[PDB]
Structures are given as C-alpha cells and as structure tokens.
Amino acid sequence: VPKWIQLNNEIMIQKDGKFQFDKDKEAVHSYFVDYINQNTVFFHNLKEKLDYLVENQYYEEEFLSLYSFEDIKEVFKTAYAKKFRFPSFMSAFKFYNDYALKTNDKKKILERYEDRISIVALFFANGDTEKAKEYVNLMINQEYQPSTPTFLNAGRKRRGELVSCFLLEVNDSLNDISRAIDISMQLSKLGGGVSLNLSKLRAKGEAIKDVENATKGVVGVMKLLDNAFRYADQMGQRQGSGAAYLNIFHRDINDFLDTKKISADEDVRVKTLSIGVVIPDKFVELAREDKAAYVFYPHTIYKEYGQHMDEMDMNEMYDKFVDNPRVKKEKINPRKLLEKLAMLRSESGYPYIMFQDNVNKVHANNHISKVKFSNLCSEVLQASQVSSYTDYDEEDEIGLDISCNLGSLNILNVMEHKSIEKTVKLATDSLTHVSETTDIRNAPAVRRANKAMKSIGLGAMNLHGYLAQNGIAYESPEARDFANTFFMMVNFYSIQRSAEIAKEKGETFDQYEGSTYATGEYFDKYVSTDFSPKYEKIANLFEGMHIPTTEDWKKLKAFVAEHGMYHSYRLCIAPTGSISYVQSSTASVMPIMERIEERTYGNSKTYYPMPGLASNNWFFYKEAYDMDMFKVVDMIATIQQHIDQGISFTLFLKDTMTTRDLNRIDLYAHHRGIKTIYYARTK
Amino acid sequence: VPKWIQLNNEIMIQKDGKFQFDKDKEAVHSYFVDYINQNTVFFHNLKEKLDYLVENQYYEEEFLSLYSFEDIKEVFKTAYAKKFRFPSFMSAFKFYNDYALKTNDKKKILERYEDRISIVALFFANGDTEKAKEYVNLMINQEYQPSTPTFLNAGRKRRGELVSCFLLEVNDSLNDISRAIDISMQLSKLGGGVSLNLSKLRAKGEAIKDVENATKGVVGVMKLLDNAFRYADQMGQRQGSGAAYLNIFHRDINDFLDTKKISADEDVRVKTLSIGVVIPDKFVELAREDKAAYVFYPHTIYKEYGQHMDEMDMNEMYDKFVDNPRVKKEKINPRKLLEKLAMLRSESGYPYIMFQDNVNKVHANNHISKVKFSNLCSEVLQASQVSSYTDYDEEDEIGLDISCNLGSLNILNVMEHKSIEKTVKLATDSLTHVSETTDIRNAPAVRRANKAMKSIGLGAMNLHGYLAQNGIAYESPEARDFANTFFMMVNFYSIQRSAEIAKEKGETFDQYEGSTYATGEYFDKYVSTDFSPKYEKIANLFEGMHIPTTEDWKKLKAFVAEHGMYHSYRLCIAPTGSISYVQSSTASVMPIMERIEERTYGNSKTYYPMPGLASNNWFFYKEAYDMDMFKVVDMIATIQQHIDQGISFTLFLKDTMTTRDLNRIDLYAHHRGIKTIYYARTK
Amino acid sequence: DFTQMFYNQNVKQFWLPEEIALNGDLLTWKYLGKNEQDTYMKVLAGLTLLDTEQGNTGMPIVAEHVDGHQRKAVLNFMAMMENAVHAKSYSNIFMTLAPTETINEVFEWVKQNKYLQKKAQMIVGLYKAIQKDDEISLFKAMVASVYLESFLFYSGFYYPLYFYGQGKLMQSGEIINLILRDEAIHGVYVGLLAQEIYNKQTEEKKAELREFAIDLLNQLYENELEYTEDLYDQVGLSHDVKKFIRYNANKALMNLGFDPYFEEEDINPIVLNGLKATVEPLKDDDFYF
Amino acid sequence: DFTQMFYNQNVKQFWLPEEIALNGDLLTWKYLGKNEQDTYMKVLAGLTLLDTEQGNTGMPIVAEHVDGHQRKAVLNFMAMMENAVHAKSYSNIFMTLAPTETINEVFEWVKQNKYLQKKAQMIVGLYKAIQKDDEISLFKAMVASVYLESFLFYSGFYYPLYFYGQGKLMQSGEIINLILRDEAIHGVYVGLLAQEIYNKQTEEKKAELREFAIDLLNQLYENELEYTEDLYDQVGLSHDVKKFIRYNANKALMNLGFDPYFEEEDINPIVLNGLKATVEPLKDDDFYF
Numbered sequence A, B: 001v002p003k004w005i006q007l008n009n010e011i012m013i014q015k016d017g018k019f020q021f022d023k024d025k026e027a028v029h030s031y032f033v034d035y036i037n038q039n040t041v042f043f044h045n046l047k048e049k050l051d052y053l054v055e056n057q058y059y060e061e062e063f064l065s066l067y068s069f070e071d072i073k074e075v076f077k078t079a080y081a082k083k084f085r086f087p088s089f090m091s092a093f094k095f096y097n098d099y100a101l102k103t104n105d106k107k108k109i110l111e112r113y114e115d116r117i118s119i120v121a122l123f124f125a126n127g128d129t130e131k132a133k134e135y136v137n138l139m140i141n142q143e144y145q146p147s148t149p150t151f152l153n154a155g156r157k158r159r160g161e162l163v164s165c166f167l168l169e170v171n172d173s174l175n176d177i178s179r180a181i182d183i184s185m186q187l188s189k190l191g192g193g194v195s196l197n198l199s200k201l202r203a204k205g206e207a208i209k210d211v212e213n214a215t216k217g218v219v220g221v222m223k224l225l226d227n228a229f230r231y232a233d234q235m236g237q238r239q240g241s242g243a244a245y246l247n248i249f250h251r252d253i254n255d256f257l258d259t260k261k262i263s264a265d266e267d268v269r270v271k272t273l274s275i276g277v278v279i280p281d282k283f284v285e286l287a288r289e290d291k292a293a294y295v296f297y298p299h300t301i302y303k304e305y306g307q308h309m310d311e312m313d314m315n316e317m318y319d320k321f322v323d324n325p326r327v328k329k330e331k332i333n334p335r336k337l338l339e340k341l342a343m344l345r346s347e348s349g350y351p352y353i354m355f356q357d358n359v360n361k362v363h364a365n366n367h368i369s370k371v372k373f374s375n376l377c378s379e380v381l382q383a384s385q386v387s388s389y390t391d392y393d394e395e396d397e398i399g400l401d402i403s404c405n406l407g408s409l410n411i412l413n414v415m416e417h418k419s420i421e422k423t424v425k426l427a428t429d430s431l432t433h434v435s436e437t438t439d440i441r442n443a444p445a446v447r448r449a450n451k452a453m454k455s456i457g458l459g460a461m462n463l464h465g466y467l468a469q470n471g472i473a474y475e476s477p478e479a480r481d482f483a484n485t486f487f488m489m490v491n492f493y494s495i496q497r498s499a500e501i502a503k504e505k506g507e508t509f510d511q512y513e514g515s516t517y518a519t520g521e522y523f524d525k526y527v528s529t530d531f532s533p534k535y536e537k538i539a540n541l542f543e544g545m546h547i548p549t550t551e552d553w554k555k556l557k558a559f560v561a562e563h564g565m566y567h568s569y570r571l572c573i574a575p576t577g578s579i580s581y582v583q584s585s586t587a588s589v590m591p592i593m594e595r596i597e598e599r600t601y602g603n604s605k606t607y608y609p610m611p612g613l614a615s616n617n618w619f620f621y622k623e624a625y626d627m628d629m630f631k632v633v634d635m636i637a638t639i640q641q642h643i644d645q646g647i648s649f650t651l652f653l654k655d656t657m658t659t660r661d662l663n664r665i666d667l668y669a670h671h672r673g674i675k676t677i678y679y680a681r682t683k
Numbered sequence C, D: 001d002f003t004q005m006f007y008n009q010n011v012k013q014f015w016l017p018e019e020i021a022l023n024g025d026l027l028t029w030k031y032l033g034k035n036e037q038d039t040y041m042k043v044l045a046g047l048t049l050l051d052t053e054q055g056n057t058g059m060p061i062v063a064e065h066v067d068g069h070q071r072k073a074v075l076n077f078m079a080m081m082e083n084a085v086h087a088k089s090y091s092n093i094f095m096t097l098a099p100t101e102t103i104n105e106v107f108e109w110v111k112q113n114k115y116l117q118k119k120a121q122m123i124v125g126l127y128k129a130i131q132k133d134d135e136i137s138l139f140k141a142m143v144a145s146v147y148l149e150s151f152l153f154y155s156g157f158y159y160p161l162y163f164y165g166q167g168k169l170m171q172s173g174e175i176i177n178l179i180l181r182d183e184a185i186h187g188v189y190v191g192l193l194a195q196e197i198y199n200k201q202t203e204e205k206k207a208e209l210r211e212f213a214i215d216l217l218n219q220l221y222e223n224e225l226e227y228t229e230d231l232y233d234q235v236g237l238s239h240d241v242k243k244f245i246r247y248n249a250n251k252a253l254m255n256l257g258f259d260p261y262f263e264e265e266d267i268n269p270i271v272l273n274g275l276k277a278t279v280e281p282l283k284d285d286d287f288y289f
Ligand SMILES: Nc1ncnc2c1ncn2[C@@H]1O[C@H](COP(=O)(O)OP(=O)(O)OP(=O)(O)O)[C@@H](O)[C@H]1O
Pocket: A028, A029, A032, A033, A037, A084, A085, A086, A087, A092
C-alpha cells in the first residue's frame, strides 16, 4: 500500500478518542512527494511545455495564439504565485485522476492544478491578459469553479463539449422521435447528459392516421432512447446517461413509472434512462381533495385544440379536457399515483419531481414558453419550444432546446474573500464565454437556443461547509437567513453583470422584451422586501461587503429596463458531484451525506473528511440523513426564491420512515415553492 | 364449427383409402354460400360502389380519374366474365382474410377477387383501358400475381408502400447509423422489410477520433436496429421485420453470429433482427485448404487504403490485408466458422448465406457496385452505393439503396396458356409502373436508386405444382430441363421488354453503358449455348410456344446494344408467402414442404392440400424434406443461371442430418453457383 | 432378472399432482353430507401418515440395506414418490376442498387417533429394528412394507374409489388411482426382495418366518378392523370396506409368495368400477464435388 | 422460508437420460487426440465415482438427520436424481464412447488414483461421523456436501464444458450441463440447511465452525491443485482450470453464507460459452401545513 494511503487511513485510527484529521494533510504531502512530483513531466521552461502540448494535439493552438508568450508566462506565474496547496489528500487525488491532463498512454502527468487553472483562464479571457489574471486569481483562490466539462476540457484539442446538460423537446411524430434519438446519441457522444420531454408524444393505444390502438406510447420511445444512450456511452468511458420527463397528466404516466419498478419485465424495464415526472398544481389539488383525477391522451387533445397537452395550463384547461367528449382520458386516483411516486423513489430514487406551477409562477420567460421539464440533474428550468423535424428534402422548423453552462461559486471562499460581487461577475463572464464558443453542429435546436437564449447556470457549493465552519447549524434559521442574503447578493450581481454585458454588446437575449425582466415584474419582491440578514451573526459574516438594499435593487431594475439582460437564465445550482472534491467543498447547497466518507479506489480504501471537519465543528457537520427534511426544504426554498432556474434537491431519507413520510416531504416542498426534487437517497 | 370448415376437415377422413380432395371444392362453395356472399357489400351498380369507396377514403381518386366510368365498367366486366372460382377453400379464405378490402369495422367485405383484380389492373394501366383489360385478363387467368404489397394496396388510399423489400447501406459514422435507424423506422412504417449492410461499420474495439477500444462494434448497431424494428411494427399490425448483413471477414462476425445463439444474454441477442452472412470465395478457399483465416478490423483497412473492406475484392485484397502491419486482424479457423454457421442454421435457420463471388461473377452492374448484401428474404442482389449522411445544415452525399419491385409468374397458369412472352412483358410493364409510382420521402438513397436503377423483381411460383401435375419429379433431370428452358424464355422476354421500354421512353437505367448488357457480355452464354429442352416431354410441354434460339438471343443482344435496357435488374424469385394461397400455387420455386398442410385459425382447424394434389400425382408431390438437397441445389442453380438477381432458397433438412450435411449442402450450393441460401428449416 | 424392468416401469410412471386440476371436484364435494366429508378427510389423512413414514423411513432404510446400485436406484425412486409425490398430493386435495381449520383439525386428529398411532408404531418399529448385515431383520421390515403397500393403504383407498366409481370427486379420484398404480408395483417389488431372503433359509427358519408374517398380518388386521369401523360406521360402509381389506390382504400375502389367508367375497361393484443438432467436423473431401 | 420454493424448482428440473441421443458424439470423439480422450475418460470417471458417494451416502444421510417432512421430501428427491438419473447418465456416456474393457481399466486407474481418493475419502469421512441428535456433526457433513456439489465437481465439469463450448461432444455436454444444473441447486439447498444450524450457535461456536469450513476448504483446494495438474497438464489447460476451481470455491462459500476466500478472476470464455419502504397511505391533512 502507498505511504499516502496509509497516512489517509491513519485518520480513522483514533488518538485520545479523537480522529487524526491532521494526518490527512500529511497524506497530501506524501501524495505529492512520492507520486505527483515523480509522475509529473517537467520542461526547461513554459515555452517548451506549451509547444509540446500544442504539437502533440493536447491543446488547441487558437486560444493560446491570442496571447503573446510573455502574457501566458505572466498568467502562469500569477497562478503559481499563490502557492496553492491541497488541504486534503482526496482533493489532489480527484484532480490528478479526473481533471489533470495526462499523456496519451496515461503514464505521466502533464498538467498541474496551476497549469489547468491557467489554461482555463486563458481560454476564458479570449485574448485579455488582465482578464486571464483575474480568472487565475478567482480559480486559484477557489472562489469559482467551472463545471467538470469546462474545467476538464477547456483549451484541449481532444476535448468534448463544455456544456454539461442538454434538454430536448420531442414532438409527436416518427421523424421527430428519430431525430431526438439521433441528437441524444450525438450529445452523449459529446459527453453531455441529455434530457428529453416525452409529454408531447401520444400515449399507448392512440391512432397513427386513422388506424387506432397503434402507438406504443412513451415506453417504446423510452426503450429506443435507452438503447441510444447505451450505444453512445462516451466511447465506453462513462456510461451514457439520459433522462426522460413525462407530465403526470399523460396517460402513460403509470407505464412510465413502471419502467423503474424493480419487478418490471425486460420489454418494459429501462435501466440507463433516468425518469422525471412533471406535476402541475392541478394534480396536487386533486390529490389533496381526494377527487379522482384523469390522465389524458395527448393526440386527442392536440386534434381538438390544435395545441399539445403540455403546451397549455392544466390548472385552467383540466376541466375543459374532462368535459370534452372528443378528448380521450382514463380515470386515476391522484393519491394512489402520489403513493406510487413515493414507493418508486424509496425503491430506486426515481422519478425526478418537477412542480410545474412552482417553476412557472416565478419563471421570467413564460412568454417564450412555460418550463415543461427539467434536465438530468433536475436543476435546469428554462423555456423550450418544440422543433418540427419534417421529412427528408423538407425544411425543418427548428425550435429551442435548452442548454446551459454550469459554474459554481465556492461559498466559503467567496465569503472569506468578501468578493461576492467580483466572483459573480467574473463567473458570469466566463459562462458567457463558454456559451459563445459553444457550437454544436448536430443539434440544431440546441444551437439555436444557445445563440438566442444565451442561458448560463451559475451555481454554488460549500454552503454546508461554510455554515459548519462558522458554527451555524444547517437547519437553523440563521443558516436560512445567510442563504437568503447570500443568494440575493448573487442574484443581484448576476443580473447586474447580465445587464452590463447587454449594454456593452448592445444585444439582449431573444424575446427579452416580453420577459418579466423587461416589464420590471421580476424585481417586485426585490424592490419591496429587504433581504439583509435578520441575525447579528449573519450580518457580521457579511461585514466588509455592501449588501444590496431596495434602493440598489430599484437602480438595478432601472438599469435593466434601460439596457436589458444578456442572459435569459443565469443561476442554476447543479449537484457538483466530483469537482467539489478538488475545491475542498461540500457538494452543492445540499447538506453533507456523511462526515467522513469511505471510498474504495483500486484495491485500496480512502477516507475523505468533510472540509474543515474537526472536534469543535463535528456536530455542526450534521449528516443529511439525520436532518429534518422539512428544514432542508425550507433552506432550499429560501435559496430558490433567488435562483431563476432550479436547484438539484436530493432528499435524504432514513430506512425507518415510510412512503407517507416521503409524500409529506414532497407536498411540503411543493407548498414551500420547491421547483424540482432530484433524488430520494435512503440510508 | 362452420359448415365450410367441416367440409374442409372432411378431406383427412379417408374414403376407400383415399383422401377426399374433391370435398375441398364443396367447402369453397359453402364458404361462399354461407359466409362470403352474406358479408359482401352489394351496390345497385358499379358507379355507386366506386363512389362509396372513393368517398369513404377506401380508394384513391387519382388512378380512377384517368378513366371514364365506361372504361372502368368495361374492365370490371372483363374481370367478371371469366367467372373465376377458387379451386380450394384456403385460396378464398386467404384472399378474403388478407387481401379483400373490408369496411373500417372489419365486418363486411367491400372487394371481391374480381373487384380487387380490376382495381389493380386500372392502377397498373395508368389510364389505358385496353392495357387495363390486358392486366385483368392476366390476373384473372392467374398467370401473373403482383406481390402482397402491390396486390393489397394498389388503388387504396389507406395503404402502405407498394415496395416491401428495402436494402440500406450504413456508413461507418454515428450520423450514418442514426440515419439508418431513422430510415429503417420510416420504411417499416410503410410496411416494408428492411435489410441493412453492416460490413462498413468498424468492429468492436476500434478507435473513434483516435481514442482506442471505443467502438461497440456492429452488435450495438444491431441492438439499436432491433429496437427500431420492434418500435416500428406497421402501427401494431405485424411484427417489425429487419435483416442485418455482415461480411464473414468482418471481425464482429462471431459476435454477429452470437446474436442468434440461444445461450446469448439479453444484451447480446437480437430477436426481431434477421442476420445474413456474406461469404466471399476467399473464405471458402481458406476453409477448403484448412488454412487459418483472418477477420479484419474495417476501420484500419479504411484508414490504410481509403476504401471500405467490403468495397474491394477480398480475393485480391486478402493477402495484402494480412501482410499489411497497419491493418489489424484476428486469427480464426474458417472451418470452425463454417461449422458454427451450420450449427446456428440448424438451431434457428440463421444466418442467410450470400456467396459474394457467385453473385458478382454474373452481376451485370459491377461497374456501379458489387453486390455486397441481400434483402430480408435473401433474393434481391443489386449494386448499392453507400451514402455519406453528414451533420445537420450540411449537404448529404446520397448513394444508392436497393428497393426492387416484386411480382410472380404462375408457372402452371402461364405455361398452360402458352403465354410466357405476353405474361412476362405485361408483368414487366406493371412492375415498371409500380416502380415509377413509388416515391419515398424519408429514404433519400432508396428514392434515388428507384429513380436511377429502375430495378424490378419478376419472380415465378408454382414450379413444383406445375411439375407434379405434369408427372415430373422435382429432382428429376427433366424438371431441371424444364426450369432451364422456362426461365431462359422468361429472361429473354424480360430483357426484350426492358429494351422495348428503353426504346419507347428513350432512356435506360443510370450507368447502363458500363453494364454487361451494353457491352454484350451478358448475352455471351445465350449466343453460344442453346437452352432448348433436351427431353421430348419438356419439348411437348413447351409446344405451341416459340422457344428463343441462339439467333433470337443474338437479335436481342443487338436490340439491347442499339436501344439499351430500361431496368438495371428484372428478375428475382421471392418466397411468395401468402399470395401462393390465393393463386392456388406452390410457394416460389421451392418444393412443397407438406402435401397437405394443417393450420389453426382462431379455435378452428383447416386443411390445405397442395394444388392439384390427387392419388395419381401424390408421389410426384414429394415433400421437400424427403428430397435430396443436392438435387434441389441443382434445380435452383439451373434457375439461377437465368435470373439476374437471387432466388429465395430455403434448405429443407431432416432432424437426423448433422451440421456436416448442412455444410456440405452449403458448399455444394457455392460450387453450383447458388447466390443466396435463405433458410434451414428442420423437420 | 427383474430390477431393470421395475426401474423402467417406475420412471415411466412418474407424475406430479399439479398435472391434475382439482377445481372440478368443488361441486361434488360441496354436495356430500357432513359425515361423508369427515370420513373422506380422515381417510386421506391416514393415507398421508402412511406415505410420510414410507417416504421418510421405510423406503430409505430398505434402500440402505439392499445390495446393488440398480436395486438401490429403484428403492430410492420409490421413496421419493412416497413423500415428494404421494404424501404431497393429499395436501393438494385438502387445500382445494377444505378450509384451513378443517385441515388443521384433521392433522391433529391423526396424532391422537389410537389405531393410526398403533399401526405406525408397529410398522416403523420394524423398519428401525433392521440390523446391518442381518437378513432376517431386513425380511421382517420388508414384510411390514409389503403389508403397508398392499394391505394397509386399502381401508383408505376404498372411499375415493367408491366415489370415483359413481362419477363423484373424479379429479381427486384420478390422483388416488395414480397413487394406487404406484403402490401396486412397490408392493410387488418389495415382495420379490423379501422372497429372495426367505428362499435362503432352512425349512425350519422358513416355518418361523411364515409364523412371523401371519402373526403380524393378523395383528395389523385386527387393528385395521377397529380403524375401519371408527371411520366408516358414520357412512354405513364398514362391512363393505372390511371385505375389501381382506381381498387386499390376500394380495399382500401373494406378493410375499404365500397362499391366500381369507376366503373370497363379493366386493362392491362400484369400487371395481373405481379401478441443438449433432455436429460433425468438415472433412477435406466435403469441399470437392 | 425456502423448502417449498426449492421443491418446485427441483421437480420442474426433472429429466431422464433417454431424452438425449448420445450416438452423434462419436463424430467428434474420433477426432480428439489420445491425451484429450484420456483426460476426458479420467475426468468422467472422477465425476462418476464422487456422484455415487453422494447418491449412496451423502444425500440419504442428510435426509435421515434433518428434521421436517418437507425437507426430507426435497432431500429424497435430490437423492433420487443422484441414483436414478445422474448415475445412469454417466454410465450411458461411458458406454457410448469406450468399449467395455476400456471402461473397466479407466475405473481401475481412477479408483487407485491418489488425488481422487484423497478428496473422496475426506468427504465420506465427514458423512460417516454424523451422530444422532448432534447438529454440529450434521453441519460439518453439510459443509462437506456443499463442497462436493458446488466446488469439487468443477475441476471435472471444466472439460466437458470446454468441449461443449467448442461444438465438440455436444450430446454428452448437454447431459453434463443438466447434471451440473442439478448439483448447483443441491449445493444451494444444503447450504441453506447448514446456515440454519450455524445461526443457532453462539458467537464462539460460530467462529469455530468458520475455522472448520476454511480449514476443510484449504485441504480440499490444495489437493484439487494437484488433481488438476495430474489430469490437465497433458492437454495444457491447468492454469485456466485453477481459475475455475477458485471461482466455484467462492460460490460454495457463499452457499454457506460465508465471504469469498479468493480474489475475483475472469473465466475461460469457451467454458463460459458452455456454461421496499413501508407503504403507508396518505391520511389527508398531509396536504396542509
Ligand atoms: N498539499 C500540496 N498541494 C499541492 N502541491 C503540493 C502539496 N504538497 C506538496 N506539493 C508540491 O510538492 C512540492 C514539495 O515541497 P514542499 O511543499 O514539501 O515544500 P518546500 O520544498 O519547502 O517548498 P514550497 O513549499 O515552497 O513549494 C511543493 O513545492 C509543491 O510543488
């Protein structure tokens, strides 16, 4: 066993009844003085390194050609001047195993952390040396972390796409279904997770040109997509991951759910395609009143009204659907469907739950389209227009397929540096650059939506780490007050940066004029309610930083009205799974699953303590499963009120609790304004 | 139990030690006195019937509008003047259960046999009343039978395409694979059987964008195609049928074959995807000499030579591939592979066997392309060019995808009417009309090849029926003499009609000038070898009909040289599954499987004796399984020497014979010039 | 001279109760009087007990002591039939016709019934008295087994056969006929093995073995009379059943090579009416024609 | 919790030797080398000899000491399969491939073979050591039985599966596959009966029984390695056979509820080719907060 492995395992060997957390630090030293420094490839100077990486097809030469070598040297020197040290063994291990650039045979390490950060910063700046240094300082301080696609692939010749998630709308036609399968394979080839809205597809037993009971429903398309994602599995490196979203009022909703039952037959079971359910407020109202609900056949509704079932408001059209004899429907028990959802989530963690009305009551771009589904991580909530892929030799009507670039603020590092504004603006600029340089030649709706919406996702990580390292319980009202203030600041500065980009470029996102940003409605709660901390401890935490007031929000509203906004969507809180290790941060705004996690790598086992875990903050690092899910819902709703897109909200459940407890948590989330629920992980 | 079913089951009841075959005739009468006439919709006049069928979206207005009502009435009167009577119960049952037009509620019969024949004739003639009457006389004499798609769908508004055999070339790319899946779905939606060539696809463990061990091979593509064919199942009417062809020198050939093993796992086996193997002469030579063979990685060959492995002659390329270090290959035992093929055919009848050099040594259009694969029934053998389907908003390079037009001569009815020439020419004209009226807007290469090649398949059936009713054993040399003469006349008149159509329209098929028809090579064996019958009995059978001599063939060769040939391909012998029942004929040129076949429809049993079966010809109606497969191979080769495309050749084996016997039959078929082997049906 | 043909006969007679659907008896069962249903349940329960011990103990123990792999294979197969097929079939019948409480009660009734306990005590005692390499103790157990197969089952078999012969409870009756067909061949086979041992003895020893067999038969017979009266008096059939068991006692004696002991009597005529492909490698000559 | 389920699976797997025609194997047998034919014969005799012990002693002795009517019935069924089906099947394969004199000589050789005898007598020794009403001695015998069913047979099964996966000796390979499928379920079932005893023990007694099982496994494994080299070196297969032994040893341990002993290894592909949370209804007022 390696020396650093033994040093890391020495953490759990208690001394005087206490964990040896400091041993972890020793491990990193070993991991660098025995493996990383020996396995790294050193050159005489930076010129030889850059030339070797360029000619050997490791780096794209275009982004490096925008800078003179003196500027690149200055950027690299700025990166190395911080003398960044990984405080935990797992941070360095995760970076050098998942994100550091290696040779073709993967026998040596070509990129250090500073090298990777410098390359990403130079790609972000697009020829601006000062901007590149700003990005270097932002990432080496670990205030901002680009998503895994962006951080791993920026400036690389053998790179994939920098966009993490893609959302596709599938129209009710064989041509559209085949095009959706093709685009899903193309985007999984690019490495991104693909989500498909199957609510427009007509249910099982519908007519294909006057011959009835002909359609296979959404389950056949689900099987096709599952095989497509199995085939396109990132060249066999990462399993192809897809998501299917169906409205709960679709007739196939049961069969949909039956794809995830552990007793499902092979002709129905789907195993590589995640499932999500979109629940309008009408379904929750029907379940609450115990009135029997009706699921609908989408094609009959489309024939009668000319629009898809998910294209209009069910809260106002459900009674018209039910009373219409030309609309076909089936009777269901909404409470039984809710119990089935809870049982499925207990068994397998599926489906994802999207509260459609919670998303669309604060959605700023309802004029473009209502949000009808979410992404594979159930945090992207954007307007999408379905595409009409016609026959060959016929022009296709290209719609809008959602796609946003992810980037997370490290809350602990951002607040320690007292740089919410600067970090938010620089992250917005980096995400705007990632969107601008993204061009996908096989997904036309994705390309058009990227060019028009200009949507980005700016997330946050290390919420629980910051709260526990500052002596604040994650479930406490003080923690929710901190989240309210911090994310109001993040939203304020993201809107300010979006408006500044719109002013400097003279262009807004497409159809911005009909948005609530243009009409000023979006700023209502910000121009009437003060989001400054209500607790003295939180206010002290925010000292040295100008917390925006109602007057600052009014000025920002006027600025947006004058100049517009460059981005249709700005903030989305992704799960941030593996890149949180490198940043020494807790995953996303979720509470920690465990204080010390035991992970098996190779034939060895490693223990990763939570960042900053110690004796004095052991009980502030409360495990998520031990927490009240209602207070976690309260925290997520408090954050969500300042996030325009959704938050990947994983439910952390105990084995003792029943499906009724899961249903109660889901209904409280819906009541509190939670937009989406990601996972039901049971301990 | 209905009266006609009792009269049909009375056949097996033996009187005086003989089957009551004549009772079947009585059954037909009952089937018409009790059921057909009662459930047949009658109109006051044909005008009312045509108006009702057109208005209720049963027929098409376009083809009926080309004639005055007097001409349509005259065509219907010509059809009804024959007073055609089905000689067996199963003929009428199959027609009125499969082909007769029924109401939307499927309880009444709108079309009789004469009505359907008249409608198909009017569709064929395209406005010529005399030509329509000629077609009516052809089909009511049952000399020619349009295929199930053409016969069932001609003149019907609610219909699939008139072509059901489609051959697709799949290029080695994700875009091409997705396009192939889409086209397969679209053609299965039209009701056609789709065959895909997977030899150009790179094997498992190949590089994608210079990353190693990334390709899933052809088995993942087969899984995708199997899912696509399961999804597209004729609006839930018939099981989606598809075929995949792989060259035996493709490295995936074992895994390909492993898709049909019973022991194969769920992630390996494809259930609705037929498989065929293309066997070049090089593989047979390697197996014969017991030299170990090599299966090659197609992408390495493409990188080294710039052409696909299946696009070049393996006979001259195999040694260069083996000696090339940059071509990756795996060692195999060709005799072990042959034994595996025989074992798999014994277990499941798969794969289909295509002898590439047997096809291509007589292929007339090798300049366009060599025949690389066959159809789902393993009888279509045509030149195909792969298409380069690029990314979106980029122009695709459309190639040639095979789609031939099926139609079968009834050898008994044709020869008893002494009308080989007239029937062949009229069938060629009808096939040309159906090929010209076919327009598929979702298969670009299929449409392009249909427009360019103008390839049709004119088959024959009732060969064994005709031979048995004339006191000739199917395995006798007299039967092979008759087949030689009859199919040489069929080829002569098909070529003459093709040249006449080319002269009339002033156009040949695309790239005809490079064909062996243009150079006169095709006629070589016809201008030197006399194909007149060598037996007096066969000559007396051909009495009253002019048998083309060598001088006639020289005149035809000169005529083709002067005027060209309209069809790239003219003759292919399809299995003729259900139309053989309606025509009261034995299926294809195959020998009969059973003298009397027992079938179960609903909860009732039915008995179909072979047409013309009696005590006198009971011995001549020898069952296929009791026959020597070498003599069946000899007869099929005798026919194949006059057929430009292949013949659906099913092997009929006993359970006693082993895989050595199957391999011997396959090798004798290869030796005798058999182009394709369809199935290995074990009794 | 016989084991192979018994082996073939036993394996060709293989069956499972699930092959026979029993829901067809539901109505003819419902229609029987309470007395008739009671006797029927108890009769089958007595049979279940006998087969339980024949399968668990009797056949395996005889198999252990009989020499020869083929003889052991036949005896092992017969043992399996007793407990895996026969004893289980009765539960299939019970589970179809009767509610759980009636089933529970009848199994409690077998435990406390003195005639059923006595006959089990006597038969199983002889099985457990077999001594290795002692052919006389083995003979005694084989006599006991023949008496179980060919005599003791018959006080039970009478009633299903009596109904079958009237066209009543015919699915249950079909099961019982299959069981009876098996026991008939089991009794013959074990009888032949017993005769082998008997034929090795002196005339004096043979005389003692006949005494043992006849004394045992009489003791079992007297107990079976009381059992028969206890079960059948409430359905009026005791005298008829007694004639049947005497008939079958004679068959058991004959299976042992002994003369009949009871005089012939007329049995109820109703009960009489109740009765991959092969693979060869390719030769170099298969590539040339 | 499990006996009726295993009853079902056992009886539905019933088969007879006569179902597979063996004569077509001669068409591939004639093409094997002397070493291949020799190894096959020796392996086959090894399996035959071990399976006879299981039919005559192993299964019947366990059936004798296990309490429970339904368990005794399942165990009887398994004993029947050993003696009536498996033993006849092995004999049939032999009689098809070798003349009488060759069969007698192979059995003479394998009967004297040191490695075959060592394992055969080790297993039989544990069966002979079972004491009435002593569940510890019964458990030890069950461990021995599971090791035979799920582990010791597999050094032998390797070769027929190896041929079967190549298209050689397909008829006898089909028979062997059916036999192996029976032994697999036998091993799992006896394993569950052993775990039942194990779970009734104290923690110290459990640790002692674990040590017994691992020690026994080690002794058998070291002899299997020698047995393997003795038979398979002449056909160059020993390395791959050893991987197959360890893989099956791990299955045997898992049958006994123990952790795998050996690291996971991939198996020869030719041989491979041959081979709820509590639902609680919503009570209303859960929709209001
Ligand atoms: N935790 C760590 N994170 C990142 N790099 C590390 C870490 N520990 C060691 N290294 C690398 O290994 C080298 C070993 O030097 P070390 O940290 O022991 O101190 P040093 O030799 O006094 O110099 P310096 O600390 O100034 O780099 C470091 O210079 C650095 O490049």
